[PDB]
Amino acid sequence: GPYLQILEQPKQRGFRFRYVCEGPSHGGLPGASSEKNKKSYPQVKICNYVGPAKVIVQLVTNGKNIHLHAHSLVGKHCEDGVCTVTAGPKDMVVGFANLGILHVTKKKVFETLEARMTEACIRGYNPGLLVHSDLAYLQAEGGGDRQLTDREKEIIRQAAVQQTKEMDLSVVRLMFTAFLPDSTGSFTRRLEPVVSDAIYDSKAPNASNLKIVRMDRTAGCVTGGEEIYLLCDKVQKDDIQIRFYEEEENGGVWEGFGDFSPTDVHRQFAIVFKTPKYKDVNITKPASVFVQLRRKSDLETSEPKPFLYYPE
Amino acid sequence: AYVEIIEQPKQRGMRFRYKCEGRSAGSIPGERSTDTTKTHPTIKINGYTGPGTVRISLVTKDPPHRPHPHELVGKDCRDGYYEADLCPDRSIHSFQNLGIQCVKKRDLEQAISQRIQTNNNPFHVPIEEQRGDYDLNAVRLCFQVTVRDPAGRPLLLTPVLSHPIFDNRAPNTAELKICRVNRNSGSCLGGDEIFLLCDKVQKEDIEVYFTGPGWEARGSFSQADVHRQVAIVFRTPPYADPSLQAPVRVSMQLRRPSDRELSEPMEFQYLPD
DNA sequence: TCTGACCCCTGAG
DNA sequence: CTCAGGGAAAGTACAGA
């Protein structure tokens, strides 16, 4: 059958959700595989090349229950929260270059929310499972501003209140949807939608890219128990640990961790810890290994840093 | 009959708090108050002792001491200032719950209007002057004390000001503080790198000042060496005697050139060759 | 009783 | 000199003795 598919998931980390006040031109959600200055970008593709096509995209929550997030896609042909493109041309692979993610203020969550839920009802291209399942019966059909039943408009202002209460603004997702040509030339032939990989705001201390900026010492005795001052980027004194590791022949399974309490974390930008005892305190030649910052929550790490172990 | 300050307000360390924080803001420490033994703002009424009242408001730091937008919140504080009756049994009076409540930027005009509409102007400054920019990180306490004259009538004594009190939330006016340090000794030849952890500082306005009798020098480093305002990586200066033959203790402290402020001294020891 | 994390300015190019 | 993109900073929020 005819279905949609994604060719390059959105890079999950390293992007900051810009507030309105922040201002224009700050960046734009990068393509997961932007290994270099290859300026990557997300790209969806319709399998059953149905000549003319219409593919849209709206941001969504990352919890168990998929819903409409309050943040909105700003870049590209993105209007009133969601982006829209065309696929009629020579191919069936749409892309999405340059289009930041606007961060909404907390007070304005409920507002923007209900306003992007109602809009999801008086606007076809928006499903009816992101606003409330009991409304799916509203899928893509016609256009033109009108008033939604006051019987159903209430449950709309009700879903908002119940979905505003636990909305996490530090993470959002992409909800790709493709509509094909119908019988009256109205792109309303909906194809199974597909959500992307969770995008994390490079500003929430618990999803920011970790990094060792410098250490006062890069070598220590295999005996361990040596104090070391390490300077890093924003981190959280309760969700951080310093891991030392080595990749041996039988697959580097050895690791050790810097010893330290949270009071040893200075204003989130520095950590003073004690080196962990190396595996073999009997070596006769220095043993070079690696040190890295690792978030205890998502087990995400920083660029490994070389650390030398020398005989006692 | 005049008001004399016998215990000034500590000038630095306490941050101004906003309304959005705890209902109970800070409490202005004395000046000689120690971590163990705390003291508080204290005045003495010379040439008088008996019944009367005392009011304390906030005026700017500089000369035309006009009403300050901030509020002096705390026990017996209303409309921005504290007011209570003096104790007829004593001439010395201390206040243990004074707190600066800093206003938001966009409520600056409202704040002044409330200063006018409330008749809070200890120095009766022309109203046309209450429009000029206000320094919001420094305020002065103002003691308006009212006694009684022989006719037994209300006698408002001449206003007295304390030292300025600075917003510690602000790096430029903050209390300097070395929190932790890599090592505290090194050769009298200098060149030893030191990792210093400190409270917020502005990289373009900071120094490490080594001091000893007949000897003054500075730690070497560049702004790039200041990590996110809270850590400084520097090199030690060469001690005066290049051939020490016994440890010599000296002082090491943070220095702010803008207002030539200094942090409490940390002990450093220069060792031989 | 208090105290103690959640606007621009550059550096590229 | 523009402009992505970070470093400060202003203002908001609780909690742990």
The secondary element (H helix, E strand) that includes residue A154 is helix A152-164
Contact, B260 CB vs strand D, < 7 Å: no
Q: Would you identify the CATH topology of the domain A1-203?
A: Immunoglobulin-like (2.60.40)
A269–B contact, CB cutoff 8 A:
yes
Domain parsing of chain B, residue ranges? 1-169, 173-267
Q: What is the homologous superfamily of the domain B173-267 according to CATH?
A: Immunoglobulins (2.60.40.10)
From the options 2.40.50.140, 2.40.30.10, 2.60.40.10, 2.30.42.10, give the CATH code of A208-312: 2.60.40.10
Beta-bridge mates of residue A5: A45
Listed by number, the residues of chain A in 156-215 with a beta carbon closer than 8 Å to a beta carbon of chain B are: 213-214
Residue B218's beta-bridge partner residues?
A: B209
Q: Is residue A119's beta carbon less than 7 angstroms from any atom in nucleic acid strand D?
A: no
Classify B163 as helix, strand or coil: strand
Q: Are A312 and A222 in contact (CB under 8 A)?
A: yes
Question: Which of B177, B195, B203 has the most A C-beta neighbours within 10 Å, making it the best mutation to test the interface with A?
Answer: B195
3-state secondary structure labels for all residues of B50-109 = CCCEEEEEEECCCCCCCECCCEEECCCEECCEEEEECCCCCCEEECCCCEEECCCHHHHH
Q: Which of A52, A138, A50, A55 lies closest to A94 in space, CA to CA?
A: A55
**CB-based contact B32:B11 (threshold 8 Å):** no
Whole-number Å distance between alpha carbons of B111 and B139: 14
Residue A202 contacts residue A15 (beta carbons within 8 Å): yes
**Interchain contact, B231 vs A272, CB within 8 Å:** no
Residue A83: beta bridge partners? A57, A78
Best A265, A266, A271 member to test B by mutation, with max B CBs in 10 Å, is A266
Residue A266 and residue B182: Cβ atoms within 8 Å? Answer: no
For B197, the closest of A213, A214, A270 (CB atoms) is A270
B181–chain A Cβ distance below 8 A for any pair: no
Considering only the beta carbons, identify the residue of B195, B200, B230 that sits closest to A229.
B195
Q: Domain B1-169 is classified in which CATH homologous superfamily?
A: Rel homology domain (RHD), DNA-binding domain (2.60.40.340)
A272 inside 8 A of chain B by CB = yes
B181 with B269: CB under 8 angstroms?
Answer: no
SS3 assignment for A38-55? CCCCCEEEECCCCCCCEE
Distance CA A231, CA A182 (A): 59
Technique used: X-ray
B24 touches strand C (CB under 7 A): yes
Considering all nucleic acid strands, name the nucleotide whose C1' atom is nearest to the C-alpha of residue A19: C7
Q: What distance in Å separates the CA atoms of residue B236 and residue B208, rounded to the nearest whole number?
A: 9
Compute CA distances B113 → A113, A211, B101, B121, whole Å: 38, 49, 17, 12
Q: What is the enclosing helix (H) or strand (E) of A160?
A: helix A152-164
Which residue in chain A has the smallest CA separation from B181?
Answer: A229
In the block, residue with structure tokens 């200075």 = A266
Tokens of A209: 């890219």
Which part of chain A has CATH 2.60.40.340?
Answer: 1-203
**Nearest nt (C1') from B24 Cα:** C2
- Give dist(CA A7, CA B219) in Å, integer: 55
Distance of C1' in C6 from CA in A106, Å? 13
